[PDB]
Amino acid sequence: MEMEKEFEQIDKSGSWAAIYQDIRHEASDFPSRVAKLPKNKNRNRYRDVSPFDHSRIKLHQEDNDYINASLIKMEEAQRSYILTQGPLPNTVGHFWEMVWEQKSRGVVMLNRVMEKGSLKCAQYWPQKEEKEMIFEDTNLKLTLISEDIKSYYTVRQLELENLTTQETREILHFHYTTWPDFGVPESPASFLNFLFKVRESGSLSPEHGPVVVHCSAGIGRSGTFCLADTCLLLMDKRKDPSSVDIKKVLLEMRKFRMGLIQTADQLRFSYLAVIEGAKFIMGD
């Protein structure tokens, strides 16, 4: 069923809440035993948001290999994403260790450091060229190289140095800065513009490791980003683009990380983004 018609049908009936709860009811449940070990309590921002053991990213150290991050692997779309929480004061070093070990080219950030008057994640990147950051726990150096500030997003060029081997790599930081404190954007135009900038960079392409995507918990806004990307890619690949079922794609993704898409408004926004984005993907 064409999603645009499904959309008008749900909108006229006002059943977004009922569709959303059906997804919550059918979603996968797998063990998260490593996340709940007492030694990892200060490595988790939220008690109710954990990575499944089968899909969790492991840090390459014998000490403690634990980070709140999951590998989402979409087999038919040929795309991989790492979804993670906003780093904490004691996990900023782990975060950049993961970016290094997984060979990521891009970090996508969908929140501000402060929202609703509270801290949503650590200031984990340098704000001035001449004041670089050193993560002594993981032996990495991070330097700001350049900054391009636009109306809806900022792109930053960062240099990450493995202080152990003196290798360096260029990491692109894509920071979406205008998601509202409450609800979802009214139009998806600026979100879709942002996704096409990440795509154009090469950050989502198979010659790199998976892109690292985060918001505060790494399930809501982060969910919206990878669901819209995967749905548009499937529409460009398949003979019948109207066969793309957004609810079935979301349930496949929820086999790899719990809670992706946090509200009925985020689900509706995801439909709107895919429907509007398809008017490019189908030859305009």
Ligand SMILES: O=C(O)CSc1ccc(Cl)cc1
């Ligand atoms: O290490 C990086 O990410 C890039 S550093 C750089 C320095 C000078 C010029 Cl002209 C370009 C990049």
